[PDB]
Symmetry: C2
């Protein structure tokens, strides 16, 4: 039962944003590493996430965006003047957007999608997520099946809005000016890795970096190169003015 | 009076190529570092280089390229099966060219120019190099001026061939497939730093990386971030199959 977290440390703050169907557990270790290096971190959980899959179906980017903004406000109200943001997958798309919406010290996108998938494909992914969750609950193949059939009676009408989010941020990359570090798994199995080149080339940021990880999979924060990832993000954050 | 160098270590070999008006001293610390990590290194010196400026004006890229090829051959003739190449400034242009001419395990370009400077600007560069060299010789301002007046009486007819080299390699970046690491000083004062983006985006290599250095000038090998540069190049070489 994942929960949002808030690792308090130095005056430099970093908002950590997870991806679609993910939760704060996907960016916790990164938060712990940054905390140890003196960076206070805050990771909210989007609505519909960190709960049974049935609750995800009726939420969309308009809801998750609120969670992102309130997460930023969380830190501000806590007194933190300058805030950086690192997002994983869809979290990276929100980081870019936040980057041209409110004051941001630096932006780190980690395997953020910049290609538009069809609703059919996105939904397939949601089905895998739901079935995998029910398996983790311990339920049997029999109960899973019955619950998945009920699950399918209710279509997810927010996938068109998810396509709209990606398209909108992609169309507004030229509004990004804050220092950005584009992180990407060279052999990403979930999104088109070329997404990293679109972000890196289209943002207007005078300070922009891109790094490819050759051994990692899509969820780079939980893969075999997380230690290098941590070091790279830390070095990037340390290079900012603050 | 600088000289070529050959630091014998293991079977992984790296050819180190210097830039226009430079010599092997410019890539020596990198050589020592790679040697200290087990990499055999060889650095030739281009004709017209490592000697008085008066000699430079009678040489051109057709000459220097022969020293680059003989450098590659030097390592082959010594039994080294796989060879990577790292070049500084113009050395990077030759590194890319070498990359699609003979078998190369990996390429590192460090502040390589991809924009064509006018012949006048290039010559201004040569004049500056000549003056500084004479200054380092301990000659008085008056003597330097007299020698510089003389110097100007001999045009350097090969600056047009230098433009040809850059245009030609730029036109053929799509022929580069070997793993490539583009290194670039963000605030390069000698060349247009955007050159790094042209190389990174136009080569065909499945494995390509680009990294910017925020506090280095053009001769990045001799500046304040060289220790980090060394580590990055080593990590990149280590990531190759070999």
């Amino acid at each position: 039962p994942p929960k949002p977290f808030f690792f308090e440390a130095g005056e430099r703050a970093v908002l950590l944003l997870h991806g679609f169907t993910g939760n704060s557990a996907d960016v916790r270790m990164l938060g712990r590493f940054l905390e140890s290096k003196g960076y206070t971190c805050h990771a909210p959980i989007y609505k519909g996430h960190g709960v049974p899959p049935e609750e995800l179906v009726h939420t969309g980017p308009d809801d998750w965006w609120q969670d992102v903004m309130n997460g930023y406000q969380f830190l501000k109200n806590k007194g933190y003047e300058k805030i950086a943001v690192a997002g994983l997958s869809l979290g990276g798309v929100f980081s870019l957007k936040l980057g041209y919406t409110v004051p941001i010290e630096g932006i780190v996108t980690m395997c953020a999608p910049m290609y538009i998938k069809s609703e059919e494909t996105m939904y397939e992914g949601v089905l895998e997520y739901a079935r995998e969750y029910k398996k983790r609950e311990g339920k049997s193949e029999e109960q899973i099946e019955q619950e998945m059939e009920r699950f399918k009676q209710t279509p997810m009408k927010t996938l068109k809005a998810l396509q709209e989010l990606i398209a909108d941020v992609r169309a507004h990359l030229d509004l990004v000016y804050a220092p950005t570090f584009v992180v990407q798994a060279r052999h990403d199995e979930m999104i088109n890795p070329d997404s990293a080149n679109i972000i890196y080339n289209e943002i207007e940021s005078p300070v922009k970096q891109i790094k490819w990880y050759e051994q990692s999979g899509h969820v780079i924060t939980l893969d075999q190169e997380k230690d290098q990832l941590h070091e790279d993000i830390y070095a990037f954050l340390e290079s900012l003015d603050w």
